[model samples]
Target: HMADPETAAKFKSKNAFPDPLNDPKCNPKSLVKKYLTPKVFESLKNKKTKLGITLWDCINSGVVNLDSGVGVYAGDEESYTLFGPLFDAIIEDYHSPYKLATGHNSDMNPAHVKAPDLDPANRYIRSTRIRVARSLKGYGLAPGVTKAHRLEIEKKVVGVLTSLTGDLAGKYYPLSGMDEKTRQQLVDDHFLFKKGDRFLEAAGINKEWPEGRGIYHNNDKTFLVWLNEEDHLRIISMEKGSDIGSVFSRLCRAVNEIDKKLGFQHTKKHGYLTSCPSNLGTGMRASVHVKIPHAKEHPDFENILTKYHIQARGIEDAGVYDISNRRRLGLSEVQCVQDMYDGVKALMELEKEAIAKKRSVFPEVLKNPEVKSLLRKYLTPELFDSLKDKKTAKGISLYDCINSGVENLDSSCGVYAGDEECYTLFAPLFDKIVEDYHSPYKLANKHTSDMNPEKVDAPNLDPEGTYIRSTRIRVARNVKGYALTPGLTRNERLDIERKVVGVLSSLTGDLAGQYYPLTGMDEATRQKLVNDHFLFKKGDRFLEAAGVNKLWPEGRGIFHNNDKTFLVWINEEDQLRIISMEKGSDIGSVFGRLCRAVNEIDKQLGFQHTDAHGYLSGCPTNLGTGMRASVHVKIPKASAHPDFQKICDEFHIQARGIDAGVFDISNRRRLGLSEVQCVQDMYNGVKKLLEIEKST
Candidate 1:
């Protein structure tokens, strides 16, 4: 059946069914059955997979035959009513089923047959006459078996017979020639048969459908047999296919065909037209599934291969697989399966190279000593060695190593009292001596047996005297011990020992012994020694406040009684003090010259300073005023007077006179006269020298 001009034009732009079987020219049942094999018929069982071929005709007929009793046929009352007016409105000779049916009919019964009554003989049609007329003229009439309708039926029959052999002969005769057997076969092949039975059996349907009735006939068959008249005819010429694969293929082909015929015209007329850009050339794809391992041990693994530009997409959790619509178009899972795919490929190539060069192909050979040696050049020596050994080497035990050497040297130096080196080299020996004599068990006594020194009976051995004498003895012992230890690894030990010897050598000078004499020393000198070794310095108090004194205790004081201070004194103080003295000497010329001379003497004689003055004022050139430089220096902003303070601070001098038109200098300079002044003004001469220097 053809659509009206306007209706046909509405769907003109869409692709039409391209298969010849669906075209009007191939409308014969025999042609349809010829293509419908048992396999294709079985395939039509799946609702989604079925074709749309036979749907149009059955739907347009608007009749369903159910197997209740012998047979029960039902038609839509609404469709029948709509058909009457549609048929009446259509012009004769229009290419429509309604036009053909209504125009050829001669019966005039509006209820049974809605055709015009051209003659009174168009009524009372029997079954035989109806069959004969329908076969020969493409039209049929139903009998009016109702009461009082026998005469009207006879009249309607005669009218139908008049038109049958008249105007309808040419239009209806050719269509009626198709036999009942062929028509039944067409219904069975395209309308009744289910095509997706096998697929449905494999992919079971959800429980919503009846157990055995889940499968459906193809769309063509289902639409034709089950849809209403209007829907059926509306979709008559639509494309049909077995599944997504077939449908997409058919759609592409139909689109191309339409493009070839109407694309240019459509563009010229409408300015633009839709087209699939990707499907312009080759329109089909063959795809397969690929499984790749999650672990990556090889350079050319699946993911790596994909990264290198292979067209692949991964499915989550499951292995990768390719898809081409509904078809399984790739190599089977087994055929494409690979174990260590990337590793195998790379190793194979490597084996070939090894064989060519007459080398071992075993994996271990790649890590052999010679090969490793060559590879080691590219890596750090430590890392390379670690790799070669397959285990990490122990790091050097810094404390053990340094202490071992120190003990060994102490052994050679004959400092070992029992002819056996001390069990522990007492790492803090030097520090303790420099900080407090009683700070360490080893430094408290010159004889190692007196490690915990006994308290002296003199009253002077209280906090001040005990601390001073103990620290002085401790420093002297440590300096001697450091001098005795010979071996040096890092610069710290040697630096400490050198500094210790330097302080001792500087203090032992003739001028140092004279100014800050060890002979008959006063209680103040003892106090000064205690302060130098134990109490933290002025600047060190701030460092202590800041919590950084522990990190750099060079400027901080050490208390003899505290455990931490004692440890620091024994372990770090001597060396640190040496470093401090060396740094302090740089502040003044006299101190610098004195320190240099002491270092020279120690180097030449190989002896350490033992006198108290050696440490008190350890250099000749820096004997008096220069030795007090750190105490004399003043910060102008922090001072009571600026000009005098600046001069005193800069030159290590004491400023003490009232100058004309100037502030008194007494408040400006910090004089190092406390101890000397207590000694009956012994430092007055020292103050005179500083003033004279300032005046110049």
Candidate 2:
């Protein structure tokens, strides 16, 4: 029988079933009974609650013959295969209800509870019998050991049917269209859906029917809708797996085979969408629910819960689902039932543990004596009496007492006895107050200093550092409008010239003397020191010439007398430039005097400027322009025609273009002109114009 063409082909082609009865050491019947016994079903029925289970029947029974063609049965095997694990899990939980429920009900306050009604004789026996009946139903089989056994079988049958139709969906809808890698991903999504359904169903929201209903119809013989809960139904379609385990497994295998085939071929010759379009990826969603007593009372609770991986939401009304699709998915009913059962179960366990430890779970309230005394001590008799019932004495406001102290009572009032101010001559104590509460109040006084100089005596210490030491101060006098005295002094012009030259020479020599050579220092150390102390070294010749062996001590005295004038004359050449105003005769003369003074100071201090020759010779603009001020302006030839000349004559300004007879300062040495001489030319033109005006 196993060698039939279809079965042999299935086995040979890598999509085959495993031997179900392969365990040679154990009996299949005993194994099934020990592992799949319906203990949770017994608990449910004993508690007067209905039990339901779903499974894929057609594929498991081997009645789905697909030899006709590529039909529904061909695809149904996947659903059956996927539902197997779910069925196994359900059976495991059903058999272990006592273990699951033991600690869940210990804390119940029996006096404040209602009990469920159950049939005494049928309760235990009927649960098992139903499991047996379920196993044998729809398939030809002899009667079980007893009616209870038959009933147990019947229950199993219903459970298998439910699992087949509702829980195990991936069995029917194969992920064979997806790639090998993605097939597992699709299975995972379906598995999460199955687990979520199991949890919801166990919490009393049956996925085969709507909430607040049972799995069986009114007659109790016929089955209800294929799906119990609308929420579970929506998830179990393409997103979840089938209710039958065998069918679900077969479906998974078929899906893997299809994926393998698709992966082997690269071209789009066979167009099949290879990944789950709806779920697309892993579908497991882990969530949490928190119930806090007072949200504001524990400010750090939310952060603590988040750290512990718990999500909290406020409950406006008791037993309401705060999940995303509460209304559309009918999650509220499921949440209400689950919350009540889970909360009561947890509380019951807590209570049981507390009782076992012999501790009072709820303690009595105590009244604070200090609060009562504070109220009487601070409030007036009438006010106190009025507030006695209006406020809790234990929670009286200290701020209110302080505010009252600032009013009605005087500074010396003995509202509080034993206070020193209470016995003051200006204000007497009130004798009716509590003596023990009295305390001295220390007062703070503010003092202001008078602004008058006689009172303040000007601060003995100087804060501005205005009085320190004396030093040479150079003052520049404007000679623009100053006239020479008639005959008071000897040779005033020559005296001024000598003074200017001496000062300039002294300044220059002082600058030259300040140059210190780092001869004994290593090359690296000297370079680093110079870089750290000065702006930068201009050239290599600076350090070479200023080296200790080549140091010139006589160079410091070179700034005295006419030598200073000669040095200034040489250095002043480099200082001159067309753009620099310091190149002018008046400015240069002043700078020369300053330089001379600096040189004299440097001579006294034993230091000098480092690069004497280079400082005077290295300026290229000085060599090229020869200290001449020749202004070059870009004039538009288009607008500077003869008419523009007439306009310039009207405005008394000079106008020139390319060939205006202006000496090019670009080659100043050839013209033998100094900056002041160039300025003299321009000034003479203006002076002649003014003279003509005067003549007119």
Candidate 3:
């Protein structure tokens, strides 16, 4: 006890009070005073900081030295020898535990870095630094080794490193006489340690600091070695760019060059010994300083933290953050760098996407919003859907489907929402609608594109005169310089009807047809034609729902050849429905004759064609080659099958009830392929039904 009351007050300060060691639990027989003699224990009893740390600092952090966060440092060589195994027990045992001297570097390969390079100015990455701690074979780690041993290791390394002739040529900069400006700069850059880091000061590694500490680098500063910092040696490789390969490769070479002259302190159980057991194995901390201001919350950044043990930290300040790989033990230095390289790649992708989607970096489908709004006024809610702008299918971005429009689910063509390329996206929705309309059964030919002949499989049928009725292939066509039928005025309708009727009057060859004006036709005869299904009649709600059936009888008429096998509709759903309905499924004859008429009419009318959509119509479904080739076939047995509808679907055909249970097998698709191909599809698909019919 001190006699002076002031000394007693100072000694019995509140924080240091109650003689913490005197607490009943303080001297837990299990942990304390392991190697200390009673004399040593009494000498340390009144100490404020033992080995530059408070007695309770170690107790507060954990029993383990590294867990203390400040790490473990011995006061003298005797203390060093006594506590040599503390770091091993604490850090090494709690978790696990670099290499060159044995020249095995068995697991370290600079070339093992496998990741793509990012922009030299990759905003995602600020800088890269990979360092590995090591010790000389003869000296203990910093704590247990004498200052003389540090000098020996430092002197040897300085000679080996400075003598390097190639790119690894740089002078040793001992901290003793270093300029304050250069020193602060290096510390700020994390290339060197600050003079007063509490963690190092408490570890006893800072005593006589810088006098024995030195740094060596290549001419480019990409390669460096820290002599007597945390370990006996800290070999480092770093650079500005986000290329881990070059940084790691340069590190490997630098290590390779120095290991020739010095042996690193390595053990079979621990790759390289260090003061902190966490650096037991590999002893490498491969880290990067990166900036992803756009999204610190991005998925890749999160993934880096989870999968690779990489963490983000402020660059001396929180405004910027850098990624660092965690858990250095049980891993090769090469693997550490690889982990960093790969994790950084994921981060770069996140940042890339962030920038790509940011409004500043930012659709053309109806791209002009003003135009889109104007067009939407007349648009109806029909089949409407859109692909996710970033969606990819069949190896193509779905946005390509629109060519470049406002990314909307609707366009001028009602709700046929998909862009031209993305019609594939509308198949299920369209199929569901058609299935309800056609039958209660689910459709097998689910895609609207199934109607195209080129896409559908060929099933040649009844070629040699078999169960064949008549082949009627009709395609809706619209003339240019006119509003679509859905929006047509009485004058536009009358003018369109007269122009089409005039074209039919000039038809020649097999298509030399007569135009019958419905206005002058007898009611009884017209009703008879309507009953026989040879002419267009006023449809009920389906056509009304589909945006057709406007203008009524004013401009409605039918044009047909002398045999009535070839017909053309005026102002029906569109400007025309050129048709060839004759006996037998002769697609070539039926389709060829229709082609000639279309070519002739197109020359006179020029037809409504466009670069993006090919043709325009009120119904986008009828826009491109709206050709429907149907065959009326009687197959009672096949039709009775439970999967009969599916049979029609397999061949991309729709079976509609004709009369007396007879059904017309028609190609359902009307666009996205040539017109003749549509009829060919119907003819061939119907042929397969004939076989399925007989077999059933």
Candidate 4:
């Protein structure tokens, strides 16, 4: 009765299950690509054509189902071992283990390695736990085991468990006869996995749950075993604090004791076999719940965590995440624990800095001399000019800052000088200074330096009496190798600084490199770079308040071509701000040069990009294409026209003060547009504006 009567008889007849040949959905060959990853389409090249186990055998009764688009299910152990590469994807998850084993030592036996204390003071971590799933030698894996097979496993496991004496002794609590009160209480207290976790349900591990499922926990509940769940036995040892060392030591003893009495299902290739491929190697999972709220949505969080075998999950909300080891495969059990432990400690270091910034007020930092020293270094006269110190207005407000250019405490680039965090958080002030003092043409303010001979740098694209002053286009980019500024460490920031240097240094052909470290560069050259806005400052208020500017001036630098037509800003806002600008309306060439430069850079340093967000950055505003291609032209008519803003609106562009008399026309939004589309919009907008001006 555990299965639908019609489904229960699937194994009885060949035509009992709907044949995939008749139904395309059931065809493994077709479904593998549709449901499973298409990357493994080539992996379907097994010697056997027929699965020996039909898809219905595992998906029937509605209890057995796919955990994901494509699940790994076997009718029996024979089908499991002989499964095709596509089916094995459930354990492989697309990519196979690079190597069979990493040959790292363990925390037990001859290796006798020890686990480090993750939370020595119990400040962040509340407990340490490690569990290993074990299937008996003869029993089938959870996803394929029959209803009756599970019952037999329960009894056998209970027999060996009940026979144990001393610390290993525990009483069996079966779900079949156990009262609801104790079960609910245990479940409420996080002592048991919820009876119907959808993941387990889909895997068919919950079949005949009460009849063959139970818990056998020692008196302390610190040592326990979960019976007939994902594995026949989920032996666990857990306790408070970062004392995974003792927890791991106890696990070794329990594993040895249990194995001496009952053999576990394992193989040389996979070490100890289990349901999930990620748990195959040591059959061990080193887990802990820590408080690192800021690490959520870390640009490279998942990728970096996977490297250290760290996986983060939210215990309550998105911010308070549960960090744990990604898997036990490939490395020694102890090595997995170390990887997890070390990764978490690094995250904590980043978090502590964030916490310090959030907790510390601004004025408190101004009192410090080292903080003052930092301000003088980055806060140049350019930034001071941008701040309007009004008698009526509060503190220093943004006069000609970037972004909103408003007199507000924070609007990406705007910040109040007297803001308490300013004294303490220098990078923010430095960022403001970078924008304020360093001249970037102030395109919004109409400085007509470009029209003047002294203002022109490279070949003036608009030397023709008709239009166009300078053609400049830029794109925002971040590295996948590190975290974004908000959640990254001082060292992580420095790493990006150096990595960017490496990328800019590696450029060749038309894209040769000449970097200018702000700290060491000549004042005149720096002035020219700032005036053209080819170089921008770092440590904006928005980033500083968010705790992004860590250890100023370490990684901050700029690179440009000899002609100064092409430029790059490293460690400013996003990791890399790539720009290609020459004097003219020839955006086709400008955009093309940028494309080639980007491709060449990607060849040297791949950017962190995702389909959801074309290119990722700390600033959500600069997501998508992260591109802004603009050509500053002398459109005095459009500047003075009544519908100028409205006229520009049709093309989704903006008309800003190009300084002196004209306006700087460019696209408005960065999101929901493409690099190609972005350039086209501006190119078309420039042409339209000129067309309208000519008619006028």
Candidate 5:
């Protein structure tokens, strides 16, 4: 089927094609390495497009750099079909999990879009840009186009661009003879694309050194086009505000006008083909430069983007982020715009909430004898007053930390954070406590955050469920943008309840559940839940002393799935206590379920955390992984073994008796180990104890 014998023969040799995996510099995580399997390379290596482009030219950039996410590039319209196996895999990976047989469709009608103005006041969203790639039906693509073909493509495109009427009228500037200073100035202003892109350069797209490359902009510069760059034409519509509707409508009008004169290459299966597989489908990228302030750094930011089918990256400014729709395949233009709008709206709300929670020192707390225990050791009068008057963004002061300890002198940690800021706001006291409780964790020590579930090794010690009754794994989680239990105002507490309830209700499959507020439950129902061990009792001396029990039952509740294997205690000692359990010795199943539930809940709420302390919690002891994996087992013989305490110490397990013959065995330390490691510790210890029971 190849028309050019010379070009086709050049790549017919097996060694002619470059293998990205052979290059040592290639990142193991690169999509190029992932989709470009040996079978796929063998199949597409000798292929050539009708424009005399070989497979080598399409994957040269990725082979050289090895850092490419989607390695292959299209040299012409036929490049996609010629190497359909490789391109299809990469496209599906980037766009959706759905198969490609469903095909792609387009929707450029701005009237069909449901996105409202993201930030009408221009407070967060700075600018908006909606762009699409178009390749002429018969022309060669950027990576392999001949110099003469490129020049011809540019000439035809510029002719159509310059003939526009009214606001669409614009001038063309060719890069061929442009002054160095003028080109640099246009690039610096972001009005023109810069040269020296390693990816494009490696692909041979820069073969003629800007011989036919240029830009076209309307009189207002709001509408523009890039000629003979990554694609034959990169039609763009942009403006310096959050008015996405205006920018999108303008882009639609320009695209309609241009497409009528020059038919762009397209297919029902792939929509508008572009250089990269990631840009296949409609070839649309609608983005906005938005200022999300402090919320942009949230731990759950990437997860939220994935949830909304969008992406974000840092731009020129400190707080400004470039947020855009991530998928261009298997979806329409209006769907892309709606995804961006919804994601940006959510991020803006998070920013507002973070701003509202913006912190200082608390001196009034020193009056309590329990507070003075820690404060006296760390704070000088000046230093105490210096921090005493300060409060966190959420209004947590030093008083909030000491409120509980002051009420109960028996408290060992003498201080509890009202929010994450309490640690930094009252650092003098919190710093010392962190050192004492976490032991090896100094002010400079970094806590581990590895929660990979695959690392957990939990063997069924009692395979037949002989000694074990049930297995449970639970973790304490506190949400960002809210005060911890000790520092919570009644309104903040209720708001936290409302937020968590909404998230808990949305859980699906095994983690799905219903929430029961403690307020309206009858005395019998409440007692039954507690007696059945499906719910936590309302009273605790420590929680009561911390003012956590104030306005009794206002924001406290429990959520459990239909089977009650999964449960969440809201507005508890921590903001949330996520638990997973089953009536067996299957520790792995319980731990796996808990990890899944924790990940899902954290994705929505963005739990409070730190690099040095791990997950933020009210108590210093619950820092780091903040997870406890335990199993209630009958170990009458092992409980009395002389090596019982020694085995517990060796395996890092803490054991406490529930009944004379039954014990609740769990991991001892939470600060240093990861969630998986903590569970492994419990498993190892329990396994040893069960063995001892069998033999002793």
Candidate 6:
């Protein structure tokens, strides 16, 4: 018996079988519970193979690692028969359409194989490899093999490997005798396998590790064999470049030669059996390290490969993917290799299509007469023509930067950045706008922020609360690691919106508030908020044209405090529009609150700021402080005076009509000044105006 009689009967009980199905953290698609039903468990649990291998020995690894992808292991050669019910189900799932009655065939004729060279020019495919697993006929598989038997098999395989000649002739390096430096070098070159993999460790395959483990690679490192690692043998033939045909041809010759020397464990039901049933058919895994630079960006890249019975995994190397044949049991060795060849060829063609699809529509955007923008001003015809064909690696174009401005003719300083990359990618056009808007502020000048509330020096202009209606101050800010409005995808915009709302929800005291998403807000609530001037309305022609209006209400929302003193507009003109307001001329109180809120938000969600541009924003005009300190005051007499316009210009102030002789006044320059300096500009300018009104 695999275990004592008492232990074997205890293990045979259906109730005693470990349950991986009930574990929520286990892989959803694992085959353990699907095949190991109570009825089947009772019938096969106690049954032992000639080698004393039982069902418990075959499934112990699956129980230990509920998260295992396939979740089953073979203990010995006879474990396949003892646990045939469980093994058959797992094998069928992994290799769909493989019939239990139909015997698996083997065809490894290199000249007869039809797979062509994937990338002869070496433009995409980096390397190709074909490998098969085999075990000596009488020896137990990795899991149930004794330490003595493992060493015996390793010794026997090493002697047989030494008899090989030509390209397959290589020195065997035993793990016990190999030094760390030499082992590490081989591992780095992808020649040797790593030990202690969870699946193997749980199955007792790594027991007394390094004692019987060794690797043999040919002189050219093209042909290799892993002994007592995962299996008795993992013979591989690989080479640089995309010559799959040549790689297959070389592997076929080696496999045929090795099979004659050392008889392999096999059966008609499951071709060359492996410890893992997934590798049962031909025990072949044909794969390639292919370069698909834009494949990851494609929405259905994985699905496209899966359609051809292929799977791809990301590699540490940029733009390279490890693509392999997914079905190993149903197909013959030649068919397995063919599947990978055809799948990768399709992938390379799709990559070509992705590359060909990349284009810049800036030229078309420039031709539209409605585009009255600063981008047009700075983007000279010569520059436009030159850059019309160019795009950033992320596929950002000049059109993506200027589309918002072109659509909104009323836009002043009409261009906006789509992403951080846009700043450097279209620097020629951006630099001009930065110079023109932030004049006297050179590109080399660093921007510093001063948000200390005590530094703000604005006294109440309306001491009796008469002239000023309300003082509202706001700053536009963009978050790092996100594309700005014009270039933002729908999903990305929603992600940014969700993250900002989450951060705002955590605020306490006066800043704490409930976020009202526009999607679910009732008409009555929306109207009340809009009427009260607490919420922004949906229609913004500028944002609409900028492509920020995609799924408008989905990510759009407003977060305000209980008293509505502090408010934020999510997914508006910028990522965030933090505002502070009150119905008085006490700029100090409003500015102080605004500073605290900005600091708190900055602490949680780091704002995108730069030494050269300060707090980054969608609009270039809002580069530095991103602050707009403003007040609504009655200035009838001051406005009637001829010097009023000149005084406003002198103070660097902008005044816009708000009806009934009241003007909305604010600081004009934003990029070059500090936060306090901006408020000071408005404070001084408004003070001078009120005094002029008294004299008038």
Reference-based lDDT, residue 244, model 1: 21
Q: TM-scores of the models, in the given order?
A: 0.15, 0.15, 0.41, 0.43, 0.48, 0.49
Which of the predicted structures, 2 or 5, would earn the higher TM-score when compared with the native?
5
- Considering lDDT, which of the candidate structures 2 and 5 is the better prediction for this target? 5
Report the Cα lDDT for candidate 1: 0.23
lDDT over C-alpha atoms for residue 417 of model 3: 23
TM-score of 2: 0.15
Please, what is the whole-model Cα lDDT of each candidate in the order they appear? Answer: 0.23, 0.23, 0.58, 0.58, 0.76, 0.77
lDDT of 1 by residue, 144-191 (tens): 012222223223323332232211221111112345554454453443
Query: Tens digit of lDDT per residue, candidate 5, span 1-696?
Result: 112223323443444544435556667766667777777877877777778777667766666666666767888778877887877777777777646899888888889877667664344677789999988777777887788988888888888888887777878889888897667656644767757487777677778877889988887667988888888888899876677788888888878777878777788888887887777787998888888857767876777798888878888256888998877777888788877777888888888677545423333444555443553445556765667668888666675666666556556766788788888878877888888777766757667776567787776667777788878888898988877777776557777898999988888888887888875565566686887587675657777656566555657898889888998898878889888888768888888888788877788878889887889888888888888887889988888888998999887887778834677888777776678777777877888888888883
Instruction: List model 2 lDDT by residue over 479-540, tens digit each.
Output: 11111111101122223324433444343332332222221223454464455332122223
CA shift of 332, model 4, Å: 2.6
**Which regions of candidate 5 are displaced past 4 Å?**
1-20, 194-196, 294-304, 316-319, 350-696
Which lDDT tens digits does candidate 6 get at residues 146-198?
Answer: 89999999998888788778877779889888997777657655777767676
Instruction: Point out the higher-scoring one by lDDT: 3 or 6.
Output: 6
In model 6, which regions exceed 4 Å deviation? 1-15, 19-28, 293-307, 316-318, 353-696
CA error at residue 52 for candidate 1, angstroms: 99
Worst 10 residues of 5 by lDDT: 1-10
Instruction: Output the lDDT of residue 641, model 4.
Output: 70
Indicate the residue-level lDDT of 117 in model 1: 17
**Residue 22 CA displacement from its true place in model 6, Å:** 3.8
